[PDB]
Amino acid sequence: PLETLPLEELERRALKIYLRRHGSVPEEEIETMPLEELERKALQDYLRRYGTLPEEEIETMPLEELEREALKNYLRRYGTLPEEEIDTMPLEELEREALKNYLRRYGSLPPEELEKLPLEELERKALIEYLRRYGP
Amino acid sequence: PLETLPLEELERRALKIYLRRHGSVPEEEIETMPLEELERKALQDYLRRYGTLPEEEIETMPLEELEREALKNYLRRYGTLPEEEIDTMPLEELEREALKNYLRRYGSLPPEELEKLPLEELERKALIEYLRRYGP
């Protein structure tokens, strides 16, 4: 049933299931939040667990910084690529590597595709995979 | 031609021609700057030439709020919906109504099909219709 969902609905549902699994927030008050805020509170749950930073910076950091550190942690624990160029790797590339890393582990797709699939389609398959494993 | 390139490269070209025409950016970085830097500096330029925002505020503004104000500004001078909605409409809905508004002034698609497209595809046409107007 997830095929009929466009990319804006897949990101919403995936962020919901994640926030319904990690973090305690009213379940009926999750649906009414804007998608900009869904990522901020989802990636706040991520940073609070895998990398104990200052507790109030994570509340006030911009959304581009919350995502950058969340992607950085993902490559440190799930990737052998050196820590050095993780800081210098652009945001457009941290996302790409974090999705190829995700689709190789929890995905039945050969790496020949994951290196040729664009970033927009890499976001699709990784979001449809997360839902078919952790949700309806 | 342009339809064969991915959505990441479309935006990379679109933001490149914009920097070369509007404002002053050294053209010695045809593709060396990251996509995160292309979006940022091109947004502060639009927030400066087409708006009345503080200088010392946008240079420290995050990306999720630079884009928010750019759509709030773009929807004002080119939109029909009232101003009260602009502050309440979420960021994901600000992008949708901004992309549809652009695809009308410079669009050969029928408006009934403009709605049929999801937000992921409205961006492709807007970027492609932009490059056919300002690109070689």
Author numbering:
A (entry chain B), B (entry chain A): 4 to 139
Q: What did the published study say regarding this structure?
A:
In pseudocyclic proteins, such as TIM barrels, β barrels, and some helical transmembrane channels, a single subunit is repeated in a cyclic pattern, giving rise to a central cavity that can serve as a pocket for ligand binding or enzymatic activity. Inspired by these proteins, we devised a deep-learning-based approach to broadly exploring the space of closed repeat proteins starting from only a specification of the repeat number and length. Biophysical data for 38 structurally diverse pseudocyclic designs produced in Escherichia coli are consistent with the design models, and the three crystal structures we were able to obtain are very close to the designed structures. The large set of pseudocycles with central binding pockets described here combines the diversity of native protein scaffolds with the stability and robustness of de novo-designed proteins, and our RIF docking and Rosetta design calculations suggest that the designed pseudocycles provide better starting scaffolds for small-molecule binder design than do either native structures or previously designed de novo NTF2s.
